[PDB]
Enzyme design. Structure first.
Site, PDB file in Angstrom:
ATOM      1  N   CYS A   1       0.841  -1.196   0.000  1.00 16.58           N
ATOM      2  CA  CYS A   1       0.000   0.000   0.000  1.00 16.58           C
ATOM      3  C   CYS A   1       0.877   1.248   0.000  1.00 16.58           C
ATOM      4  O   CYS A   1       1.544   1.512  -1.002  1.00 16.58           O
ATOM      5  CB  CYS A   1      -0.986  -0.029   1.160  1.00 16.58           C
ATOM      6  SG  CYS A   1      -2.300   1.253   1.030  1.00 16.58           S
TER       7      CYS A   1
ATOM      8  N   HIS B   1      -3.507  -5.322   0.307  1.00 11.59           N
ATOM      9  CA  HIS B   1      -3.076  -5.651   1.659  1.00 11.59           C
ATOM     10  C   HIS B   1      -2.985  -7.161   1.830  1.00 11.59           C
ATOM     11  O   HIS B   1      -3.879  -7.800   2.432  1.00 11.59           O
ATOM     12  CB  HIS B   1      -4.045  -5.039   2.660  1.00 11.59           C
ATOM     13  CG  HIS B   1      -3.791  -3.598   2.923  1.00 11.59           C
ATOM     14  ND1 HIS B   1      -3.061  -3.163   4.002  1.00 11.59           N
ATOM     15  CD2 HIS B   1      -4.119  -2.490   2.214  1.00 11.59           C
ATOM     16  CE1 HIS B   1      -2.973  -1.841   3.971  1.00 11.59           C
ATOM     17  NE2 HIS B   1      -3.592  -1.407   2.882  1.00 11.59           N
TER      18      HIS B   1
ATOM     19  N   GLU C   1      -1.204  -8.821   3.774  1.00 13.04           N
ATOM     20  CA  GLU C   1      -1.010  -9.244   5.163  1.00 13.04           C
ATOM     21  C   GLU C   1      -2.314  -9.716   5.762  1.00 13.04           C
ATOM     22  O   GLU C   1      -2.293 -10.477   6.750  1.00 13.04           O
ATOM     23  CB  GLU C   1      -0.380  -8.104   5.983  1.00 13.04           C
ATOM     24  CG  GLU C   1      -1.313  -7.045   6.545  1.00 13.04           C
ATOM     25  CD  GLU C   1      -1.725  -5.998   5.470  1.00 13.04           C
ATOM     26  OE1 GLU C   1      -1.360  -6.171   4.287  1.00 13.04           O
ATOM     27  OE2 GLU C   1      -2.387  -4.972   5.813  1.00 13.04           O
TER      28      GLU C   1
END
Ligand SMILES: [Mg+2]
Ligand SMILES: [Mg+2]
Lengths: 237, 215
Positions: free
Chosen positions: A102, A210, A212
């Site tokens: 990001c 994202h 993660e």
């Protein structure tokens, strides 16, 4: 020699009460542990106060994280900007694996000479890439738009499919692609959402989404974190 | 440069859980201890403690990691909550409200005041001869800041008293027979560390001990 690859995670600055803090999101740290198999340590956003070469020598990899804040051309973090923009170039030139997420992906583009749209949703011919307001994490970070892998690059080498769904929590995005960066994936509206550094001695990948988030449950996110983790292991050796 | 781990606290910020560490501690590590500060996530069992300890040359503890570091010979400096946690970790106890015990002073900072006032020296501190603070050269009495509502009640077995406030409160401790530097203080020596020779002496001792390990 270390027990695990030491993966540095960039901090942001934030005032909390009367005190300045350096902060990093729990989800990035757990994704490092569980997806990359590394030990996450948080790198302070102290800019030139920390010796950059000592910092680079101490880590096996660098996670350049997402942030509500934005690279400077309303929510900004000049303290982070002063740490991460020399740092990411310095790490890639040193052969230190880098994964940008990001804001960190946007920072990789800027550091190599590219530009950003400050409001992707006000360009006129992109979709709105922002997360839906006033909703829980599970909804905000769920997949929301497609992602088209450009062949022959890092993402195809790691085995990702030609198309897959990604989350989207960003008001900024890449405008001019920096020289020396390979386009790794495009949103359906043509927005560049993943890049790699051509000729980098080590893994050097940025993504606008994202990965993660709940990393072990999405095979495409997990493959990104595992490749990053492997490169961090390689460096340690 | 020794790699000095600084403990993070967890904090919810809007939607998200964060791990946070105070800017002043990190800058004190740089400027006072001559170290490279990296922030240690507050992930508990999710990280491998032994891998964590191996990756650092020293640990600055704020707000059983501290025990394991000491047993391993990794230098430890505890500040405020970190000093309290050192005491509890070895079996001691705490006063939850020092200012309500009746025979201590109020050790809290003045409320609604700027940092400069809150973290300025506020009470004396009396070094107990023959321990770590004596050995690093501190005078027998110096002035310290005081930003704490809790404090040490029962001193844990195996800890040496290093200094007392002027009401008798134990405000610094060391670990008897620790292989390495192992010091906790109740006050905040990171504050404008370079300008106070007593705070600086503590941080330089800590940093020298971390450099030793770095060899
Ligand atoms: Mg998007
Ligand atoms: Mg006090």
């Amino acid at each position: 020699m270390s027990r695990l690859p030491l993966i540095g995670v960039t901090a942001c600055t934030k005032q909390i009460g009367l005190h300045p803090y350096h902060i990093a999101g729990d989800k990035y740290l757990r994704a490092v542990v569980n997806g990359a198999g590394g030990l996450p340590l948080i790198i302070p956003a102290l800019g030139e106060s920390i010796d950059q070469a000592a910092l680079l020598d101490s880590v096996d990899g660098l996670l350049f994280t997402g942030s509500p804040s934005n690279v400077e051309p309303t929510l900004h973090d000049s303290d982070r900007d002063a740490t991460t923009l020399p740092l990411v170039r310095a790490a890639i030139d040193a052969g230190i694996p880098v994964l940008g997420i990001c804001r960190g992906f946007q920072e990789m583009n800027v550091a190599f000479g590219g530009s950003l749209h400050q409001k992707v949703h006000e360009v006129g011919t992109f979709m709105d890439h922002r997360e839906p307001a006033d909703q829980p994490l599970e909804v905000q970070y769920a997949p929301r738009h497609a992602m088209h892998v450009q062949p022959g690059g890092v993402l195809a080498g790691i085995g990702l499919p030609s198309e897959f769904q990604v989350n989207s929590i960003h008001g900024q995005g890449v405008d001019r692609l920096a020289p020396g960066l390979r386009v790794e994936a495009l949103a359906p509206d043509g927005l560049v959402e993943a890049i790699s550094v051509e000729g980098a001695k080590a893994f050097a990948l940025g993504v606008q989404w994202h990965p993660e988030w709940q990393v072990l449950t999405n095979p495409n996110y997990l493959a990104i974190f595992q490749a990053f983790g492997k490169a961090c292991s390689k460096r340690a050796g």
